[PDB]
From a paper:
Flexible filamentous viruses are ubiquitous plant pathogens that have an enormous impact in agriculture. Their infective particles are non-enveloped and flexible rod-shaped virions and contain several hundreds of copies of a coat protein (CP) arranged in a helical fashion protecting a ssRNA of positive polarity, or (+)ssRNA. Pepino mosaic virus (PepMV) is another potexvirus which has emerged recently, progressing from endemic to epidemic in tomato crops causing severe economic losses worldwide. PepMV is transmitted by mechanical contact and virions contain a (+)ssRNA of about 6.4 kb. The PepMV CP is strictly required for cell-to-cell movement of the virus.
We present the cryoEM structure of PepMV virions at 3.9 Å of resolution. The cryoEM map reveals a left-handed helix with a diameter of 130 Å and an inner narrow channel of 13 Å, and the structure shows a pitch of 34.6 Å and 8.7 CP copies per turn. The PepMV CP structure thus generated has three major regions: the core; an N-terminal flexible arm; and a C-terminal extension. The first 20 amino acids in the N-terminal side are not included in the atomic model because the region projects outwards, and its density vanishes due to high flexibility. Each CP binds five ribonucleotides, so that the entire genome of PepMV would require 1290 copies of PepMV CP spanning 510 nm (3.95 Å of axial rise/subunit), which agrees with the 509 nm length originally reported for the virus. In order to explore the protein–ssRNA interactions, we modeled a polyU and included a set of four PepMV CP monomers in a molecular dynamics flexible fitting (MDFF) simulation. The results show that the RNA resides in a continuous groove with a high electropositive potential constructed by CPs from consecutive turns of the helix. Three polar-charged residues, R124, D163, and K196 might establish H-bonding contacts with this RNA base. The N-terminal arm from the Ni subunit interacts with a hydrophobic groove of the Ni-1 subunit and establishes the main side-by-side contact in the helical arrangement. Thus, the C-terminal extensions are responsible for the axial interactions that support helix formation.
Numbering used by the authors:
A (entry chain A), B (entry chain A), C (entry chain A): 21 to 237
Write the structure that this text describes.
RNA sequence: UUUUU
RNA sequence: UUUUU
RNA sequence: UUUUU
RNA sequence: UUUUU
RNA sequence: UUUUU
């Protein structure tokens, strides 16, 4: 009975919204890598050297490298892929810039896969004492942890081993602001660089004030 | 003689209300899973791997897993189904989110079946000493115990083995408020998470005050 | 007459539920160690040094070590196994992390065996005056006491020497909350650690307030 | 190792 | 010299 | 002039 | 050895 | 007599 979706006014209904909304899109936020671009990255890695038989596990090993040392432009992954010698993970880390993809965006795609292949063993990430995570939440001490809680990750058929607790998210939240601010004190509140604005100085006057005086630069 | 139900005013009568009220619905409360959705869950389990011959007993075994460790999102069921190897109960526990069903809602559907297959033997649930249930009411020490007292459960032709006593309900009532409050003291009275509101702290100052001072946070 | 378990709706019955439910599983809760993993731990101990003739008694001696000093990651068992010199129980305590098993989970497997080899003599655990257990319930003053009341323990053919009384469980319940809170006052309600959040301070302002003022941090 | 309406 | 789910 | 695990 | 929108 | 990523 109800017709005319071209009116641009009429109310939508349950059976229409269930089937016309073709899974919306997926969950294509700009902070996470789309499956179309990584498909082309699968092609270029196989074109560069890899076999078509083993590709995904090289992505998961590279994601586990990003799980250990945190995601950045100067991350420095240092290691060869388990597929074969000579091909360094630095070459795969350098290739991301050709297709306009950030490693931070790329690693959230395999955040559930990292969480699966991390939590099955009793092995944590390489560094969790510096950032200030507790021993109970030491497995959660890594970048792209928000990739487990969103639909953008691949979400395999078996599913996640366990749903992350609120204490992991709360610890990851304050650790982000703590780690970002700790960096921001060293060379913050200026954008020009150059040398004329910043006559010398460059870095701030340490993070030692934070423990003594609440206000910071 | 009495006619015109479309008047929207006239009084209803015994023979009309007996037959026009087609069993009302069944007892479709949102806290318990409807038989239409579990029928589709029976289809997806058979589609995933199971045979059509044995399906219900896999639900009852999964319900007995929920009977042991209590119903939650981070429950962690850890075990293979008795139908066949490889298919973990974690995969069935992960599949509930596709059809917008909670495990807590699902397990109340087989609460009478769990009560039947529990009470026929002399075996209690895995944990009844921590929650504080007495040895007489140790069989009642499990989640979805309210599923036995409502019509939403399947209520098989043989019926229940025994009607639960008031001491089981009274023990289950105070155990709910005790178990919920015990959790609530650890990270209660805040919803934002994030890290800016909760600067650190996170957890409360233990449940050891409860035994000494009546008022709590 | 009654057929079709693949319908995913039909009611289950007594003779079907008696035999189709193949002992459910056993009582596989995540808080207690499964018999499959300890079988591999039996292999690695024999591979490391032990004979296949004597293995179980080394587990029971190690369980009796966990009976004395309470189960923890910093427990510090300090002693050689009675099988042979050189092989310390610290090495067996360190080996648990390879197979993703906690000592707390492991020791509940031999809780009935500890209760049998403790109660046959008139010897209690090493420390029962500090935790606040009475002389009547001094034998019950140890961790993994909930392992006697569940089916996960091995339950030998002779059975338990005696069924634990309600006074032992009630004393063990309040002793858990007392011991946990006593620890929680020292470095509680914060998860980041690090040094920036906790400028100094670290520990709370003692448990001496508990005896004077009911509310605590 | 009971989060709801 | 009881950290959990 | 009780520091622990 | 968390730079964003 | 803790310089980093």
């Amino acid at each position: 009975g109800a017709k005319a979706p071209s009116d641009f006014s009429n109310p939508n209904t349950a059976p229409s919204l269930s089937d016309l909304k073709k899974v919306k899109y997926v969950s294509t936020v700009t902070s996470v890598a789309t499956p179309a671009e990584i498909e082309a990255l699968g092609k270029i890695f196989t074109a560069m050297g890899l076999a078509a038989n083993e590709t995904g596990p090289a992505m998961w090993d590279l994601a586990r490298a990003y799980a250990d040392v945190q995601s950045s432009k100067s991350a420095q992954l240092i290691g060869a892929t388990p597929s074969n010698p000579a091909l360094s993970r630095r070459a795969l880390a350098a290739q991301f810039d050709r297709i306009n993809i950030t490693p931070r965006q790329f690693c959230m795609y395999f955040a559930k896969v990292v969480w699966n292949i991390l939590l099955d063993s009793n092995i944590p990430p390489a560094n969790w004492a510096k950032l200030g995570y507790q021993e109970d939440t030491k497995f959660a001490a890594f970048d792209f942890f928000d990739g487990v809680t969103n639909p953008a990750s691949l979400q395999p058929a078996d599913g996640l081993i366990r749903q992350p607790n609120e204490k992991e998210l709360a610890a990851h939240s304050v650790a982000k602001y703590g780690a970002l601010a700790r960096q921001k004190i060293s060379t913050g509140n200026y954008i020009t660089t150059l040398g004329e604005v910043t006559r010398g100085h460059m870095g701030g006057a340490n993070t030692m004030y934070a423990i003594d005086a609440p206000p910071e630069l």
